[PDB]
Amino acid sequence: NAMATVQQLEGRWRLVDSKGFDEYMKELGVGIALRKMGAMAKPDCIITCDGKNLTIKTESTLKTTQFSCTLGEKFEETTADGRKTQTVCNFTDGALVQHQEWDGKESTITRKLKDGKLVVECVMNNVTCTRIYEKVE
Numbered sequence: 001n002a003m004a005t006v007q008q009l010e011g012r013w014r015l016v017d018s019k020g021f022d023e024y025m026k027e028l029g030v031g032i033a034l035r036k037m038g039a040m041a042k043p044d045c046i047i048t049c050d051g052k053n054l055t056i057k058t059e060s061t062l063k064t065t066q067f068s069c070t071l072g073e074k075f076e077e078t079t080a081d082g083r084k085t086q087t088v089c090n091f092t093d094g095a096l097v098q099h100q101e102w103d104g105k106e107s108t109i110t111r112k113l114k115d116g117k118l119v120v121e122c123v124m125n126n127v128t129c130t131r132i133y134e135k136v137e
């Protein structure tokens, strides 16, 4: 994915498209009552990366979560759905890669810039979710 800077990902983004998010949440083990609220939301995403210090805010009018970390160093993340995972974030090959592990399970969220839009790609097992954000200018 070329030689992009992580700075190109920085800033405030807004969801404009989502496909397969409900299927992905299912694979995580999220309850219907929760999946309904999750898929219904039009969240913002605020990404800030100072050198290797990464912070991602996931914000909706009802619920807001965030994580902060150092690229390359594992940390305990509390996800929005309530999972406690061992997560490492890396900016590899021009893409922000968030790898999660918990209870013997695995999931990877990959964020890249493409055609000016933030392309978020969530993967667990055979399930792939693709969510598109655009810059809030």
Ligand SMILES: CCCCC/C=C\C/C=C\CCCCCCCC(=O)O
Residues within 6 Å of the ligand: 025, 030, 034, 035, 037, 038, 041, 045, 058, 060, 062, 063, 079, 080, 081, 109, 120, 122, 131
């Ligand atoms: C009342 C609203 C409550 C909504 C929150 C509840 C459920 C959240 C659902 C599961 C979170 C899955 C984490 C993956 C997020 C990546 C999506 C993205 O980065 O684009």
